[PDB]
Amino acid sequence: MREIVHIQAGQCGNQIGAKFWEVISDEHGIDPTGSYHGDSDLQLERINVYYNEATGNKYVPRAILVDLEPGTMDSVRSGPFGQIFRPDNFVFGQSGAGNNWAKGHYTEGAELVDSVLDVVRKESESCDCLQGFQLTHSLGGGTGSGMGTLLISKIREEYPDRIMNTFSVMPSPKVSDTVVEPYNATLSVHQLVENTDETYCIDNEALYDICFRTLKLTTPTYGDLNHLVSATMSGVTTCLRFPGQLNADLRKLAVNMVPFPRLHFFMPGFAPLTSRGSQQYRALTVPELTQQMFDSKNMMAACDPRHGRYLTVAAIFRGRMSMKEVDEQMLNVQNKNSSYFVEWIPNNVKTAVCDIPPRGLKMSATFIGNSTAIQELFKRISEQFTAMFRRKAFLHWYTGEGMDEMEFTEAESNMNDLVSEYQQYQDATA
Amino acid sequence: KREHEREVIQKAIEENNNFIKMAKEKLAQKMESNKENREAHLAAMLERLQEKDKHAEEVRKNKELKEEA
Ligand SMILES: Nc1nc2c(ncn2[C@@H]2O[C@H](COP(=O)(O)OP(=O)(O)O)[C@@H](O)[C@H]2O)c(=O)[nH]1
Ligand SMILES: [Mg+2]
């Protein structure tokens, strides 16, 4: 009965957050009304991790919905699984954040954050043994980015001994809403490096390229992007939601994945890559899963793993398959490409198997890699940042909210430090 | 961090207020300078017109002085 409190902040945060709850509610046999109608006890054995029980055996997501405008949250309440959410956990303002980190972190969001922390507290008090928190948000906007990291800092103050986890969507000009996204992202990363234990880096650059090149979607929507996110999120939380030996809770995952405190930005991967309604008929063989899950084309962060080294890896296979063949294939990857795994962390690849597959598939595999190649992501954001900041472009939006140019300089420097720290261990030898 | 967060928002308040202030002062100063300038322009105009009246009195005075002689 180790509970996780979920928070979703902003448009992006609530969009994927909603899809996340749709997917796993279906995996746990919970319907839009909160009633269980599954055919396996494995579905309810660890249901308490993400759900609260009410009278009539109703299952209520331990989820808090946050935004500075009511737009997306009204869409969620009118969505398929809208009713399932605890109505009082809908915490929203009216002013919006205007894609402005400063508005979310210092002014507009500061006004709303206490209200959110009240709901968090009411949830946490009900917990038998709170593991920690998972946050879904984008880093390119204002609310999810600015207020999201504000929440994280406050939550760490009240719950300093609990694990902080995030699903952070990284901005990309291929799907850009605004030109100030590199600013918001750089300021957010600065917060994440300090105040999170585990961050899944979900790059919109990657999600777009996957949708276009692989899934052959000529005009990718956010729905096409979130089909990939929800599928990844379900996968990385499998070990948390079902019985298992490996990475069964947030802390044990952190201990396995995070050799150094600042280097906790994970590169997720998923196989097989599918589009919505594709409904493919041939299951993949265990060898096929293993080759694809490690393939660059299946990474949700636009980084080439062959350009860096793996510090740690977590692989999760779902569905009825040969655990013997899985072990063999996993051992085969490491032994065939041993150069890409740091030799000074022995046996840094851990594998889990879950009998229950995701809907629409007989076989699937989820990848979680702590690679030094993730620096490519932060480099990219840093280049976009400096291109504008060298001319102090668009800063007036931020100085108008009380921010000083120094705070940008500090944020940039810390991210450039993160990049250099990754490069340090990419060259390190035993 | 909490102290810095307070320092940022109260700086935003301070700058918004200082803008409102200086705008209010700039305007009141402009409307006062304009008032004094326009009144001075009108005052000078009448001052010249009133010297025409004085001159006209001297003309009629000068005629009366030339008459009996
Ligand atoms: N994958 C995905 N990304 C999104 C979505 N909505 C916005 N974004 C990304 O998030 C950034 C905009 O942030 P947004 O969530 O709209 O700002 P906020 O709601 O004020 O926190 C951009 O970089 C977008 O690419 C979404 O539904 N899906
Ligand atoms: Mg938006």
Query: CA-CA distance, A286 to A327, in Å (whole number)?
Result: 10
Q: Quick check: CB of A169 below 6 Å from ligand 1?
A: yes
Q: Which residues of A381-411 are buried (b: 16+ CB within 10 A; e: fewer)?
A: bbebbeeebeeeeebebbbebbbeeebbeeb
Query: CA-CA distance, A32 to A15, in Å (whole number)?
Result: 17
Which ligand lies nearest the alpha carbon of A223? Answer: 1
Residue A63: phi, psi to the nearest 5? -125, 140
Query: CA-CA distance, A380 to A173, in Å (whole number)?
Result: 11
Query: CA-CA distance, A342 to A317, in Å (whole number)?
Result: 23
Task: Tell whether the torsion through CA atoms of A127, A133, A138 and A140 is positive or negative.
Answer: positive
The neighbour count for residue A3, using CB atoms within 10 Å, is: 19
Residues 6+ apart with CB under 8 A from A363: A272, A283, A284, A285, A286, A289, A317, A318, A319, A321, A357
- Which residue, among A220, A371, A257, A213, has the nearest Cα to A304 in the 3D structure? A371
User: What's the total number of domains in chain B?
Assistant: 1
What does the angle CA A41 – CA A45 – CA A49 come to, to the nearest 5 degrees? 145
The neighbour count for residue B24, using CB atoms within 10 Å, is: 10
Resolution of the coordinates, Å: 2.5
Selecting from A150, A153, A401 the residue whose C-beta is nearest the C-beta of B12 gives A401
Q: Quick check: CB of A199 below 6 Å from ligand 1?
A: no
A401 has a chain B CB within 8 A of its CB = yes
Cβ proximity of A24 and A237 under 8 Å: yes
| Beta-bridge mates of residue A341 | A310
Residues 6+ apart with CB under 8 A from A30: A36, A38, A47, A51, A59, A84
Residues 6+ apart with CB under 8 A from A165: A132, A133, A134, A135, A196, A197, A198, A199, A200, A250
Strand pairing category for A163-170 and A58-61: unpaired
The DSSP symbol for A62 reads -
Report CA A395 to chain centroid distance, whole Å.
29
Q: Quick check: CB of A12 below 6 Å from ligand 1?
A: yes
The technique is X-ray
Query: CA-CA distance, A33 to A409, in Å (whole number)?
Result: 49
The neighbour count for residue A428, using CB atoms within 10 Å, is: 12
Our CA-based measurement puts residue A161 at a distance from the nearest CA of chain B, in whole angstroms, of 19
Query: CA-CA distance, A247 to A193, in Å (whole number)?
Result: 22
| Beta-bridge mates of residue A354 | A318
Q: Which domain holds residue B15?
A: 1-69
How far apart are the two ends of chain A, measured CA to CA in Å?
A: 41
Annotated ligand binding at A337? The verdict is: no
Q: Would you put residue A285 in left (φ > 0), alpha (ψ -120 to 50) or beta?
A: beta
Cβ proximity of A168 and A9 under 8 Å: no
| Beta-bridge mates of residue A148 | none
- Which residue, among A315, A290, A429, A291, has the nearest Cα to A370 in the 3D structure? A315
Q: Which tokens go with A119?
A: 């709901």
Annotated ligand binding at A204? The verdict is: yes
The neighbour count for residue A328, using CB atoms within 10 Å, is: 13
Selecting from A105, A150, A402 the residue whose C-beta is nearest the C-beta of B11 gives A402
Query: CA-CA distance, A270 to A240, in Å (whole number)?
Result: 17
The neighbour count for residue A82, using CB atoms within 10 Å, is: 15
CB contact under 8 A, A106 and B9: yes
Kindly report the protein residue whose alpha carbon is nearest to atom 8 of ligand 1.
A12
Residue A167: phi, psi to the nearest 5? -105, 100
- Which residue, among A328, A330, A282, A312, has the nearest Cα to A374 in the 3D structure? A312
The answer, yes or no, to whether the previous bond of A272 is cis (omega within 30 of 0) is yes
Query: CA-CA distance, A37 to A28, in Å (whole number)?
Result: 9
Annotated ligand binding at A11? The verdict is: yes
